[PDB]
Amino acid sequence: MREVISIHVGQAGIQIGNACWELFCLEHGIQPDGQMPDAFNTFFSETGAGKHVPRCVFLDLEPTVVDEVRTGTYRHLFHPEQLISGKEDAANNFARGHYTIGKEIVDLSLDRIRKLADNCTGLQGFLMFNAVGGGTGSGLGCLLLERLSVDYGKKSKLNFCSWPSPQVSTAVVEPYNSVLSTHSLLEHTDVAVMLDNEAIYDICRRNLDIERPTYTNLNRLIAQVISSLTASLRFDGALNVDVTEFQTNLVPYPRIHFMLSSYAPIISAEKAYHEQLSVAEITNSAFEPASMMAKCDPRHGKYMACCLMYRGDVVPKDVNAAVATIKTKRTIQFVDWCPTGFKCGINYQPPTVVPGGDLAKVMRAVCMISNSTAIAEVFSRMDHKFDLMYAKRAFVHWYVGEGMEEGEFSEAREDLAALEKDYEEVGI
Amino acid sequence: MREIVHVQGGQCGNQIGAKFWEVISDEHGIDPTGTYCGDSDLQLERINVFYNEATGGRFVPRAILMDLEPGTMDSVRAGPFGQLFRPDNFVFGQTGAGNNWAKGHYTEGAELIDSVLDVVRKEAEGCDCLQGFQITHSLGGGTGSGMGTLLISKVREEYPDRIMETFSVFPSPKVSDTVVEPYNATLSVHQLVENADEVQVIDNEALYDICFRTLKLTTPTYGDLNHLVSAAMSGVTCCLRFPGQLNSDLRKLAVNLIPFPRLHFFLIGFAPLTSRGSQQYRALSVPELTQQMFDAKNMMCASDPRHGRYLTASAMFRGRMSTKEVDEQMLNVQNKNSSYFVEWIPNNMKSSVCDIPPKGLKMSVTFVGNSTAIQEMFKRVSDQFTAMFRRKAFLHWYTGEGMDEMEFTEAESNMNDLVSEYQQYQ
Amino acid sequence: SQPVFASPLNVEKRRLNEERALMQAQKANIQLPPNYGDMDLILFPEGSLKNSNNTVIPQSHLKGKSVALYFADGADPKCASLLPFLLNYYRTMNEGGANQKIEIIFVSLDRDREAFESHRAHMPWLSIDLENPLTEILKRHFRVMKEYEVPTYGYGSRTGVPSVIVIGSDGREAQFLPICSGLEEGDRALLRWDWRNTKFA
Amino acid sequence: SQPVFASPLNVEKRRLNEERALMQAQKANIQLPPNYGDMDLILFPEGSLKNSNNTVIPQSHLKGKSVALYFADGADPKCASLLPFLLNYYRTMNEGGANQKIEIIFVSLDRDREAFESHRAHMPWLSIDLENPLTEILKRHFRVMKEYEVPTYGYGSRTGVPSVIVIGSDGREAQFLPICSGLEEGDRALLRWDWRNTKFA
């Protein structure tokens, strides 16, 4: 029936996917075994007596992060060969992950993809989780998308890339990995969402009041966003929008598919007692510049387009009262050619809290994902970093030794320059 | 999955390596007799990186012992945890290169390298794919420097793609061990610079300074000094053996610390380091790890980093620890000490989390920093090397052992050029 | 089978219930061994609990409560630091109400009876004496240990002393309060204690 | 007469069953001697099994479980290797469920009482006391031996210590877990356990 295939590539992909899949299990009431005590068909298959298995693949050339999945609590949940492991690390090298080591793992991945795709028709599309900062997240993440786009042409391909933080990076060669990724995910991805690490750090700081957060704390919040985004497919709602209708309303031009993310409310057991969680108040916090999840202050651009997802006891007339207030407010500016730029989505089902986590149980939630022109800033700052380090051939010899030709850096740079100009000319 | 092949060469390499396997056995809960104790899964899911099953239940180390004289072999074998090693993994000499680089690299090490290259190939080809090699030796000696660097040239040619990690010790500024130190250091460097993928520098002056001011130990022997060196050896490779929130291995370090291929020399630091008395006074928190980490007192290279600028730096955090204060503090240190960091690279610092703490502690960090302040050690060797070569002292053994004179001029020219290229980025 | 399997509480519970199931099967498509849902135990014996003024309180009067076991030691500086804040929290919770809501049963890690009485003389909430094996069996069941002294069966030590664990009707941990835990959010994790959800059914 | 004819359990069962057969035959074409299908025994007497709290439980407590005998030696390095995985498997696949699936009965091959109780303290499932004849009789029944000390009757040893064997109601070998056998699936053969079809009924 109506199914969506999830792909997790690299460290960032796998760890996020671990958080994504545990939420879906608790959501639909399936167990670590995979058998429940027909909403779940979008994520889980039907196998044997009563068991459901995920429609996912795990890819990494590093064994130690995907083997640990096979070791952990959820052994029996995942398919034995839906977690593909390499033998040797990508080591932050786009060339290594795209040319040298990743070639023998692509065809092993495509075997699992097509066999999982061909069980039924009406496949909505694909969810992609990767880190553009990383080696296999960027290199092997790319290589999969050339092989996917040529055969499975038609279908939607959403990407949830963890863009590098402006101040913090997980790596020092990551400007090189960034420029090469952003070249090759332009024409292979239909919708790209920017996730940022320090953006979710300071959300965890001022909202949940967690002075000591970690990657597990971050990935809970990210898994809530993915669940809120696809809640329309799984559960019936008053006014639903699916995966396919995102790119209709968010992507006005072929080159322009980079967009923000924000989730509200993010309230612990501390604060949850002491406000209305009113529809007006949660949509006010959603548009707040401090609640962005990409670390770019969105006031220095124009909101090109916007989508709002709603969960729980949300009535349609409260949405319209909410969105009228936002239009009235002149802190948030709009582009001239898009006079109406809001697409609402309402689902009846409230979010389900994982026990002993950090979010509180709440009646309703908003997941606002929006295309803006302020993305031209984060592309420009990353560009400035790449130009200084490249100009005298730093770290080049790693890349050019591994197969790629000196001239893919120049071609990727000029292509990013076209992306600079394209965002500039639109936003005037 | 992955395996690290260990090579220990010379007197200083073997004593360091003997202590190294003692803490790895302790971390993985291996009884000295060979068996397994401790009864936990986390100790053992990645054991193939350093050990091998022996169908008797015992784990043999993945190590090669290398010397040109059997004196120091006896010390390692007769020590505790000495029956761990396979007896055939040892290789012997009989002559012993009298701390002569030429005699270890051309005459006495040449006829031995046939035999031990077999033992490497025996262990290298043995597995699925190997992750890389790790070599501990001394650059001041004969059988460690001269014959050790010969193997590095040999095994690089046969396994080009695999990584090349060397834990080397250097001549000290103050004390004189092995009076022909600059001759051995200079001749080792201009070969190790193109054949080793990452090099990490230890100096005995730095170690005694740590025993002065931090540990407050009054009589440290080579037993104590090698413990601290061995602690960073396990700390740099922790994430290969244990899971973690963010993964790293040796190639993560290589791609994130090497701007140009010629410059691959590091400064190693370990934190925390406090005396027995001050153990229960100190709040082990991520703020106080990073302030001790960025201290000249903590580096194991005796070159003050505050003179130079950190070109790039890496920190492998270990333990149950929150990653915001991991992430923010690396950024936060770059903001105030903006004068200590190079400008034309944003975010010089790389961080990783390794969620299994070392034995007896709760959190720890190992610092691997590519600093241009390592120039101060290289200048001192070149200054000393030019002092003797100009009057051609101690040359007749080096030139009487089938080695040309013009090798020396190439040695000083290359290493002076290494000094010159640090200068422009400072 | 919650929160643990290899505990003396769960072993005694499995014994009794499967005994009872076999007798019901003897008297009468019955499922052996009985489900964890159909399993039942009585947790605090009638002569287990006693109040401040040293009078017996039965288990049956723990109905409609948010009840928590306080594993504590007399000599521990962390315990001595935690104690005044928990005292203030208990007072301000139980005073702003006609009837009382939260309740703390004290489990001791003290060295002897004299230390037990000396520490217990401060506390106004309920306590279990040291000699009762209830303390030891609850301690193994909820995985509290000061140090690894007793064989635990492949468990990891869930807590260090002190720790407050909110319990349910069947010995299931209702919620974990992270004083010295995965969050390390000491001395003010007592705020996280919710009382809608944690009811002694 | 399963798995071996020459075993103490089988001869004891033979004696009892045809004792009753002759008695009722004299009391009355009743088939003599009775079929092995007609044969039924009590495998564990009243005082055999003791759990983690040293409380005796009858055989009747094991209905609808998947029971496995674990022949173990305290000093054997292969047993030292096998033990943590066995603990973890028991732990998780029994805990994470709405049924109590499996149960393990420990049979010792240690030197003496001190070693036996020391190894049994590290263990949450059931055990048989070393003094009790049943351990030796089970060893002969299932043909496990560390070395050829006790004379098997001109046949092979089924396995060596350590061994996990799924058993039935009548001493029938339900399935053999290939720890150290023909398959040689060390520490991963646990996953071959099918707890559906092997019920102690």
């Binding site: 009431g29 167990q31 | 899971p243 149950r320 | 919650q2 | -």
Partner: peptide
């Protein structure tokens, strides 16, 4: 003097078989 090993991962501490909502 020895001490037992009492550490488990972030995964084991945070990811268990959670009870389902009623």
């Amino acid at each position: 003097p020895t001490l037992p090993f009492n550490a488990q991962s972030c995964y084991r501490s945070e990811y268990v078989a959670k009870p389902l909502p009623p």
